[PDB]
């Protein structure tokens, strides 16, 4: 099948800027017919694909026409105006001059923003769960910027690291921030063993890492 | 193979 | 007002046959030019095109696919229907059914479906309150703790969908061959714990919708 080869992988855009992404295909991508076959899409993460343009820079209905399409034979581009929050997503290409249509790996785009420090919560095993003979302290890390952190997990003071299953959101599209969540799982009787829990947070913002504690009896 | 076009604008 | 919804299972064995629905409105199968068209995505990968059924019968498949796919429609009841047999699990993935504009660009899709092909068996969630650490500021974060499902998707709202702001709800992720997912919600702490909060998540493939409120420690 024909290759849709998309550049660049990554795009990080000051707020207003503009964000080009292009799309070169292994063949021409005009059809015997003489239209050129060439549209692009957007997705963002949980969510359906969405048709931005269709046959090189035609705007599918509710596009503003901040973003543009141009190009011709084997070579295009996508141009994105005054990037927002809202503009969020990965940015893929597809021909369908030929059989299969076939798509670009992605440009995903992100945006910059004002460093900002994350807001970190813990929480103890729930009631419930503890009933089951099961533990697990949770700790999320919310609304930061920008994306590089780290979470240690200590237990009386000493590191833990086995049974830490850490998730991370996608840039989120109204603030232009990042959270994290992390969960320490353990068995009631081993959580039991101990008294000092504590999620810790190293991120660009703080001198020193943020650091939330609890102590078992309470 | 290049694809059959069934509609169009 | 062109909208499109898949149906199907969320998980079935290797070797079985895969069927799939797309129930659609806004348009009609008997309109000259109507086309409507299946895409998969697996999991963090590309789409891969399936296959398109028009408006005058004309069918076409993914040329590596299609001793696989059968499609077909029901015009009458807006419905288009797509047929995989010997499923495995490179098979897993959501698949979308799609409005098509006539040359394979698709203006218009559903939401998709998650199907998982797996010989494992489908596990319901365990649903855990998060309340803060018991004994002052300015905000309250509470959260849910969604652990042990199989297979994908769960939906995870607060309050039946009234809370929409303040919300984290993260990228479920895998323990020991089940999926474990969390969401954050963050209130002034005027709201919690005097109006109620609750998290409402649902697995469908194992028909689960529970409730959790939020209560104080």
């Known amino acids: 099948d024909v290759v849709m080869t998309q550049t660049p992988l990554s795009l990080s855009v000051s707020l207003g800027d503009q964000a080009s992404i292009s799309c070169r295909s292994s063949q021409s991508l005009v059809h015997s017919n003489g239209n050129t076959y060439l549209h692009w899409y957007l997705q963002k993460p949980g969510q359906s694909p969405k048709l931005l343009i269709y046959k090189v820079s035609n705007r599918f209905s509710g596009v503003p026409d901040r973003l543009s399409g141009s190009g011709s034979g084997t070579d295009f581009t996508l141009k994105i105006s ?25 440009t995903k785009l992100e945006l910059k923003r004002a460093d900002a420090a994350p807001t970190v919560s813990i929480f103890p ?66 959580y039991e063993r101990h008294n000092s829990y504590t999620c810790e947070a190293t991120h660009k913002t703080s001198t020193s890492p943020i650091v939330k504690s609890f102590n078992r009896n309470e | 193979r290049e694809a059959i076009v069934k509609a169009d604008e | 007002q062109v909208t499109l919804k898949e149906s199907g299972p969320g998980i079935l064995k290797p070797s079985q046959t895969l069927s799939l629905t797309c129930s659609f409105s806004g348009f009609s199968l008997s309109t000259s030019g109507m086309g409507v068209g299946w895409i998969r995505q697996p999991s963090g990968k590309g789409l891969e095109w399936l296959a398109h059924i028009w408006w005058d019968d004309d069918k076409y498949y993914n040329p590596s696919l ?92 607060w309050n039946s969908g009234s809370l929409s702001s303040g919300v984290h709800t993260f990228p479920a992720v895998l323990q020991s061959d089940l999926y474990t997912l969390s969401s954050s ?32 420690r």
């Open chain 3, 66 to 157: 299609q001793s696989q796919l059968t499609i077909s429609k029901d015009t009458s009841r807006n419905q288009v229907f797509l047929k995989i047999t010997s499923v495995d699990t490179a098979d897993s993935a959501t698949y979308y059914c799609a409005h098509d504009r006539g040359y394979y660009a698709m203006d218009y899709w559903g939401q998709g479906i998650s199907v998982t092909v797996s010989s494992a068996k489908t596990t319901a969630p365990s649903v855990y309150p998060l309340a803060p650490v018991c004994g002052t500021g300015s905000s309250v974060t509470l959260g849910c703790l969604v652990k042990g499902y199989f297979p994908e998707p769960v939906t995870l709202t």
């Open chain 3, 185 to 216: 919600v963050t209130v002034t702490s005027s709201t919690w714990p005097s109006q109620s909060i609750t998290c409402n998540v649902a697995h469908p493939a194992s028909s689960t919708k529970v409730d959790k409120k939020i209560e104080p």
């Open chain 1, 82 to 106: 005054r990037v927002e929050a809202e503009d969020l997503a990965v940015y893929f290409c597809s021909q369908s001059t030929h059989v299969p249509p076939t798509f670009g790996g992605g």
């Open chain 1, 125 to 190: 095993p729930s009631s419930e769960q503890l009933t089951s003979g099961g533990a697990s302290v949770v700790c999320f890390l919310n609304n930061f910027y920008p994306k590089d952190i780290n979470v240690k997990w200590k237990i009386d003071g000493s590191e833990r690291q086995n049974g830490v299953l850490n998730s991370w959101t996608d840039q989120d599209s109204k603030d232009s921030t990042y959270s994290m969540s992390s969960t320490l799982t353990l068995t009631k009787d081993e």
